[PDB]
Design a protein around this nucleic acid. Structure first.
Lengths: 99, 50, 104, 50
DNA sequence: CTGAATCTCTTCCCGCGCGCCGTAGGAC
DNA sequence: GTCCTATCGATCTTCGGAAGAGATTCAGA
RNA sequence: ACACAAACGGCGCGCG
């Protein structure tokens, strides 16, 4: 089942990542395995970080890191990205529902 | 016999090639991103790194 | 035996508050007026302080656990570099491509 | 002598193993291993003899 | 608990003279 | 043009050496 | 008011 996963990238160029990854996914189009890649914003909880709704597999794993200047996932190990807690996402989205 | 001499011309060229490699990263992404119907090469490559 | 007999107590070894050198001892000379010469120790402090502040924000926001955990390490990393900058797996360097001079 | 030391047996194991060493603590993938291996010594852009 | 064959952060004469030379990314 | 602003950290020309003692580590005894 | 003045860190080449 799809879950949000955490990645970190270069600040500011984060935004470029925010859309570019989707473009890369549309090029190689293992897209249905993906959800959305999202980062909250303020007038800035995450100023140089990423959230990835996806089911994690190698093919997708490499695709994510394909985009340059993305450091990679956070988790127990590189090949084992950790999902954000369901309660965390549901809380944070509400914390994002207000801005 | 195991040793050879490098001169200005040889060393410079290699240095020049290294700069192109750094262009490669920029141009490839731009080319990947570019619409390509109104973008033109001067946009795709910028002098500064080289 | 030495440790107990001494006035030291191991728990102090873990830093919680940190000292910073008097500024004059870490001068920032105006190499060319406003274009000051690099002053590594200030630079390291700058990194740590910023690294510290950013962690504070997330703690304030109560960011998801995984992110803050990474932040904690990154904080430790900066401090590690500040002291030695080379005892860790990789020394940090600026655009000049020279390893910054740590306190030690 | 080496064959006795060698734990790997098949090309899959070889490709996986070498990738692992080149990519410590990173997810293996058969074609990724091959492509990486290709980069090692079989592409000018990463290995070249004048 | 014995054994080498494995393992990595110390050190590398004393002073002097010029010369050069030091964050990235952007309101268009 | 002047002046403002936020991180700084991946993949590229890398390897260019080597004596000496505390872990951790290979083979049983 | 009877008083300061222009070096921080590297690289190359040479010197006894």
């Amino acid at each position: 089942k799809k879950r949000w996963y955490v990645v970190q990238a270069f600040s500011g160029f984060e935004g470029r990542v925010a859309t570019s990854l989707r473009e890369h996914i549309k090029l190689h189009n293992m897209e249905d395995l993906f959800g959305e890649v999202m980062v909250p914003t303020e007038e800035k909880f995450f100023p140089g970080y990423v959230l990835v709704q996806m089911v994690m597999n190698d093919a997708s794993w490499h695709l994510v890191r394909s985009v340059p200047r993305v450091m990679g996932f956070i988790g127990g190990t590189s090949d084992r990205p950790a999902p954000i807690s369901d309660k965390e996402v549901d809380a944070i989205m509400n914390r994002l529902q207000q801005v | 016999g195991n040793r050879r001499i490098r001169s200005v011309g040889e060393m410079a060229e290699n240095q020049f090639r290294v700069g192109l490699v750094r262009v490669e990263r920029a141009v490839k992404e731009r080319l990947s991103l570019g619409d390509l119907d109104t973008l033109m090469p001067q946009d795709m490559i910028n002098a500064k790194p080289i | 035996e030495a440790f107990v007999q001494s006035g030291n107590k191991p728990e102090w070894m873990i830093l919680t508050v940190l000292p910073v050198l008097p500024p004059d001892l870490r001068p920032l000379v105006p190499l060319d007026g406003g274009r000051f010469a690099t002053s590594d120790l200030n630079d390291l402090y700058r990194r740590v302080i910023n690294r510290n502040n950013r962690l504070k924000r997330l703690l304030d926001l109560a960011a998801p656990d995984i992110i803050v955990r990474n932040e904690k390490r990154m904080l430790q990393e900066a401090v590690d570099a500040l002291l030695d900058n080379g005892r860790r797996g990789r020394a940090i360097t600026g655009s000049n491509k020279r390893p910054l001079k740590s306190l030690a | 002598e080496t064959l006795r030391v060698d734990p790997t047996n098949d090309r899959l194991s070889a490709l996986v193993e070498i990738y692992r060493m080149m990519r410590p603590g990173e997810p293996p993938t058969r074609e990724a291993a091959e492509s990486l291996f290709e980069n090692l010594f079989f592409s000018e852009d990463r290995y070249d003899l004048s």
